[PDB]
Amino acid sequence: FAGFLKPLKKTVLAIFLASLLYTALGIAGSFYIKFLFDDLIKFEKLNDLHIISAGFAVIFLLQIFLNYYRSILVTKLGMSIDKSIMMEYYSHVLKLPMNFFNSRKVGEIISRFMDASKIRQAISGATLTIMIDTIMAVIGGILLYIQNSSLFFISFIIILLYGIIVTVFNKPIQNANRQIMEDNAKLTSALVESVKGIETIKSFGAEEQTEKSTRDKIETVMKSSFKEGMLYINLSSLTGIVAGLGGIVILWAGAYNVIKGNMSGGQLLAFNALLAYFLTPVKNLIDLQPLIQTAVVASNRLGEILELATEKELREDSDDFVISLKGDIEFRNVDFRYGLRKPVLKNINLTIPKGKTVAIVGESGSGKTTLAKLLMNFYSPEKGDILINGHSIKNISLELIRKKIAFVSQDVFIFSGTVKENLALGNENVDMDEIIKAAKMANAHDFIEKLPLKYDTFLNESGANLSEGQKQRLAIARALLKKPDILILDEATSNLDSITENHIKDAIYGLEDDVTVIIIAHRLSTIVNLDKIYLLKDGEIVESGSHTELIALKGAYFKMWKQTEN
Amino acid sequence: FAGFLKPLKKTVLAIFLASLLYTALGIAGSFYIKFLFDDLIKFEKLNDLHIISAGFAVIFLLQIFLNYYRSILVTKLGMSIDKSIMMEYYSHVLKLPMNFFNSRKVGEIISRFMDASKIRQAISGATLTIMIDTIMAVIGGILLYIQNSSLFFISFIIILLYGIIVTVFNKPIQNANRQIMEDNAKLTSALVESVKGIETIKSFGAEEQTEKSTRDKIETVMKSSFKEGMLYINLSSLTGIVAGLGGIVILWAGAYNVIKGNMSGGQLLAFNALLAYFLTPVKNLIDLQPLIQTAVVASNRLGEILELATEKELREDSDDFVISLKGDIEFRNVDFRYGLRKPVLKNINLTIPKGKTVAIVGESGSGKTTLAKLLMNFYSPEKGDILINGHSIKNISLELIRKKIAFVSQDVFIFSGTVKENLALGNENVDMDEIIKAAKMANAHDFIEKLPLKYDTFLNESGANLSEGQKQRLAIARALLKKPDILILDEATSNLDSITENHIKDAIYGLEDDVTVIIIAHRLSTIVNLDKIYLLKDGEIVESGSHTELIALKGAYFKMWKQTE
Numbered sequence A: 001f002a003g004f005l006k007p008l009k010k011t012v013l014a015i016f017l018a019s020l021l022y023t024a025l026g027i028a029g030s031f032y033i034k035f036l037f038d039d040l041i042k043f044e045k046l047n048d049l050h051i052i053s054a055g056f057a058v059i060f061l062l063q064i065f066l067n068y069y070r071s072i073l074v075t076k077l078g079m080s081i082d083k084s085i086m087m088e089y090y091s092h093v094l095k096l097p098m099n100f101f102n103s104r105k106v107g108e109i110i111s112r113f114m115d116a117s118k119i120r121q122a123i124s125g126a127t128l129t130i131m132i133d134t135i136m137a138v139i140g141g142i143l144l145y146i147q148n149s150s151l152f153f154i155s156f157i158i159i160l161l162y163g164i165i166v167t168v169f170n171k172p173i174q175n176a177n178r179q180i181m182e183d184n185a186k187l188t189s190a191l192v193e194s195v196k197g198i199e200t201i202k203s204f205g206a207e208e209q210t211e212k213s214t215r216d217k218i219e220t221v222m223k224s225s226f227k228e229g230m231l232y233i234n235l236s237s238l239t240g241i242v243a244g245l246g247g248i249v250i251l252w253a254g255a256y257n258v259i260k261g262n263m264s265g266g267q268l269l270a271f272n273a274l275l276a277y278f279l280t281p282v283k284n285l286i287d288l289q290p291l292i293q294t295a296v297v298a299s300n301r302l303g304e305i306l307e308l309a310t311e312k313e314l315r316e317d318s319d320d321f322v323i324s325l326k327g328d329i330e331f332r333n334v335d336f337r338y339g340l341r342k343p344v345l346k347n348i349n350l351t352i353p354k355g356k357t358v359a360i361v362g363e364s365g366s367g368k369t370t371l372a373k374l375l376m377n378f379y380s381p382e383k384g385d386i387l388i389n390g391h392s393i394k395n396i397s398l399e400l401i402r403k404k405i406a407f408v409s410q411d412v413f414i415f416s417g418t419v420k421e422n423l424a425l426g427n428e429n430v431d432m433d434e435i436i437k438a439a440k441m442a443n444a445h446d447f448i449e450k451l452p453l454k455y456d457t458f459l460n461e462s463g464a465n466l467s468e469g470q471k472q473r474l475a476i477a478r479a480l481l482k483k484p485d486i487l488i489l490d491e492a493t494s495n496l497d498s499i500t501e502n503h504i505k506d507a508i509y510g511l512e513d514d515v516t517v518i519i520i521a522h523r524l525s526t527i528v529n530l531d532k533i534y535l536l537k538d539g540e541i542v543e544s545g546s547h548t549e550l551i552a553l554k555g556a557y558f559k560m561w562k563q564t565e566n
Numbered sequence B: 001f002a003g004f005l006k007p008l009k010k011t012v013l014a015i016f017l018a019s020l021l022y023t024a025l026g027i028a029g030s031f032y033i034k035f036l037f038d039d040l041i042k043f044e045k046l047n048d049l050h051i052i053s054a055g056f057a058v059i060f061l062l063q064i065f066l067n068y069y070r071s072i073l074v075t076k077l078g079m080s081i082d083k084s085i086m087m088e089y090y091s092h093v094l095k096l097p098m099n100f101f102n103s104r105k106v107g108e109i110i111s112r113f114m115d116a117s118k119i120r121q122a123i124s125g126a127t128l129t130i131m132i133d134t135i136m137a138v139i140g141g142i143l144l145y146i147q148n149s150s151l152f153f154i155s156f157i158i159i160l161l162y163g164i165i166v167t168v169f170n171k172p173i174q175n176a177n178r179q180i181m182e183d184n185a186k187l188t189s190a191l192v193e194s195v196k197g198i199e200t201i202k203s204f205g206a207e208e209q210t211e212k213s214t215r216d217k218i219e220t221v222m223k224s225s226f227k228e229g230m231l232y233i234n235l236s237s238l239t240g241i242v243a244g245l246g247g248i249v250i251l252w253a254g255a256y257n258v259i260k261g262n263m264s265g266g267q268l269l270a271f272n273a274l275l276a277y278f279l280t281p282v283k284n285l286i287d288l289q290p291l292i293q294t295a296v297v298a299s300n301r302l303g304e305i306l307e308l309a310t311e312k313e314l315r316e317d318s319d320d321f322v323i324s325l326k327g328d329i330e331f332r333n334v335d336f337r338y339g340l341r342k343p344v345l346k347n348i349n350l351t352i353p354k355g356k357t358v359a360i361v362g363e364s365g366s367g368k369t370t371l372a373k374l375l376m377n378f379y380s381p382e383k384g385d386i387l388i389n390g391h392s393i394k395n396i397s398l399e400l401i402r403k404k405i406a407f408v409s410q411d412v413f414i415f416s417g418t419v420k421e422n423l424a425l426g427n428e429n430v431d432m433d434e435i436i437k438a439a440k441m442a443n444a445h446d447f448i449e450k451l452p453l454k455y456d457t458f459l460n461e462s463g464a465n466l467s468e469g470q471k472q473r474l475a476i477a478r479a480l481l482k483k484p485d486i487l488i489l490d491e492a493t494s495n496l497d498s499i500t501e502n503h504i505k506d507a508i509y510g511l512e513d514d515v516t517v518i519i520i521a522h523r524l525s526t527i528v529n530l531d532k533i534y535l536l537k538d539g540e541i542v543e544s545g546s547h548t549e550l551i552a553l554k555g556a557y558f559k560m561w562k563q564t565e
């Protein structure tokens, strides 16, 4: 927080000077009730009364103008701070390891981001000014002590009671706020999941189940927040008791001093009026304390997220003295266990030549996609190395891996935007000619021409504006534009029809001359004129060779191949 | 308005009585300064001073006690009302037509549901006690008029100025709140979409572009927020000027009256002291006005959705005489302008027979998935009807259609929780034997009986705990467990190996329970001996028939078969 406000130094100084002079003007104008009951009521003074009233009115007007200026500056400062914190949090969230996103739900992250609004409203143009008034009431307290001692000691006892009440109510408020935030995060995650699955929910008539679950979660949220409501009512009642009893006792003691001839009759009124510049800021700060505690809890949750190491993490002094990812894939002694579920990869030893198309075939439960994820550092192997062109993949920087390796995941995702934006995701500077070239290469031009617009149409949410095969064609078109060294075509041929499948398959074997294409697919319509086919029995590679070599031996590949032909 | 007073009336009466007693006790206790400067200072009466001070302290303690009681009751009432509003809104959202979900983004719906918190903040304990004090200050005003009858005019002028200021500042706060809430909804939508697509974003290195887009959205949100904050600052400054000038004028006029002898010097002090029960509640309400405006705009944004017609309402009527959906499926001449874009379907005539198994095939631009969604009335046909067993689909109860038709969507969605729950999305009163039977039928028992905790593993959101093929097998098992009549296998074997594919095909072929099976597949190898094949291209049934008939005809199906082989 300190670093965010470091550049803005003149604003803070102007705020402090404006607040100081505002407090001085308020203290000066608080003497109106003393001047009224000492030299303007006992004697029949009229012109002096009018002059004094006008002077105090113009002093108050100057005071309120200064308050307006200070409030504007405070609002500007707070909004800048909120911008900095929110942008920093989001920029850090977009750089977390992929194992974080597979455990936590989307709703938790969305709720923890949007909880920064509570931080925004707790440092707004009111709470910060109230804190400034609280810290500046020291001058008023000093002057109030100078006026009289016993009533000042009574006010000091009131301040001590305030402090004790605040200290006692420090932990329960935080606990209640954190519980409410956690329950609200659960509710948000459940609602996001339900809205994303609404199609299945309506298809299967699951309205009642989701309604009951959300009702239970809402009940939990309301229970926690009602506990917080009682916890705040207790503090409010205690603070009101202390404030009112202090006021009554200070009035009684002032009257006692008046009777004994310690102060004049009007100085008690001056003390009472000036008490609004010593006790009222503290009472307002105490009344706003729950808001500050909520802001503290939200900031602590944001810091809990920010504590996680970034996606870089174990980069191990990368070896950027390289030009491209051209070479041999050297999966050797590779094991991966998904972090305490069960082993999936059991010592896989495979080799891919320096530029060729290879295909990985296996059962549904085999870790075929796991190899693709491991090959681009989404995860890290439990044992062994990868050795992209004789050098370990760890020594290569993550940016180069993500830039020179093209991936087509099984779950094709298209963001909401123009087809120009979708076909150019990480590029941001590719001209149009390459766009048409890639679209025609992946057979994604014919449909995109027959649209209300051309390369400018809007796509709703996760590409709901198109069909599944259409989304697959767009996604496979996008990956071609990276001009990659390794193209991991991961089941990018599932939803495509026969004519489109044949066209795109004929197009794939024409990609330049220097690219390693790993076709993770089990269509078996393709994978017939390939250099090597890798078959894995859900734990490791068992059969290697080309199509003719695999069909020559009557093994698992023969068993899979015989039923596909008929 | 709301319709909430019907169940909660005793609590309302208790709050009302507590408010009257609190106001009366405060008015009575305000006279302390008058009794101090009129009867206890001119005539030294320390013995009576202590008694009066103790009595007023007791009065204040009682006043705080009833304030605590009223605050408790108001907090409970607000909690109940917020629960009612939240549940009503969610229950209405869950049963909206699919056009609403197709058009509107997820984040917008999430944000305008979360706005229920902003609706809550204005029905809290303090925000309602301030309003009840404002409405109860009539007694204080009456006593003010009785006491002085001349200084009350200045208070009336102050309240008139407050009303003028609020009437001026009503609309711009409303507009700024609308703008900031809409911008925040857009930012939330972008955030949700980016977090969901983080996989592709990381794969393609598009972190910088998404960061810049989110930065721009945050910046426009903050621009609206700063405009609203400047408006709030202006309103607060004018209110403070009015309050302070009014107080100074009260003091000046009281001093003038005291000099003229029309009223005592302690009566002025009492007037200024008890003005806090007629002018301070008004100022507190005027300061809280932004929260009321935020609640109003949030409630209006909820109402925007709430006025939409639910899916069950669009239906004209229903017929009780239908109990089973088994029979023929007759797609009469039907055309479907899919949301004004293009005619994906036009002049379609299908005559699917009684309970059998048929396939619909074509290029990946046809209306196969659209036809399947029309069969479940996910969309309303523009012109035509889908006759089922001599009954039009429009005149059938929606829940019967949903329950008797199983759909294996291409976007296989697996909800977080127990796998048993993931196989029991629909009916709940299902024994565990049926679940394992369905899993065995869909070739899912073998891989599911290797998990660390059998049918109890907690799968993550969207079924990321398993593979896409395993998710499809789970969906097939769940659809089979539903025990349907018009089971639609929409490419249920997209990425299943030929082993599991053959097993599922054998299970489907051997089902034989008078179930009309529609298999929308791109793999012809699973259709070679599958009754009648409907070839659909450009929204037309160019030709149909059996596999041998289509081979003999030598149409597009023959070309696709030759290319695949």
Ligand SMILES: Nc1ncnc2c1ncn2[C@@H]1O[C@H](COP(=O)(O)OP(=O)(O)OP(=O)(O)O)[C@@H](O)[C@H]1O
Residues within 6 Å of the ligand: A102, A338, A341, A344, A362, A363, A364, A365, A366, A367, A368, A369, A370, A410, B464, B465, B466, B467, B468, B469, B470, B495
């Ligand atoms: N997020 C995950 N956490 C734990 N285990 C997982 C996860 N995703 C997949 N698995 C399991 O680990 C293996 C991953 O291989 P997977 O089945 O995804 O590859 P695949 O052959 O590409 O899949 P498919 O062809 O069936 O879509 C499978 O056995 C799967 O059940």
Ligand SMILES: Nc1ncnc2c1ncn2[C@@H]1O[C@H](COP(=O)(O)OP(=O)(O)O)[C@@H](O)[C@H]1O
Residues within 6 Å of the ligand: A460, A464, A465, A466, A467, A468, A469, A470, B102, B338, B339, B341, B344, B363, B364, B365, B366, B367, B368, B369, B370, B371
């Ligand atoms: N949400 C949508 N908005 C507009 N058009 C759509 C939408 N979904 C699909 N379409 C169009 O409908 C056509 C058919 O898609 P669909 O019926 O979903 O799958 P299939 O092509 O397998 O039948 C596609 O060419 C697509 O352009």
Ligand code: VO4
Residues within 6 Å of the ligand: A467, A468, A469, A470, A495, A496, A497, B362, B363, B364, B365, B366, B368, B369, B410, B491
């Ligand atoms: O749009 V398709 O469901 O024919 O791949």
Ligand SMILES: [Mg+2]
Residues within 6 Å of the ligand: A368, A369, A410, A491, B467, B468, B469, B495
């Ligand atoms: Mg896979």
Ligand SMILES: [Mg+2]
Residues within 6 Å of the ligand: A467, A468, A469, A470, B364, B368, B369
């Ligand atoms: Mg489709």
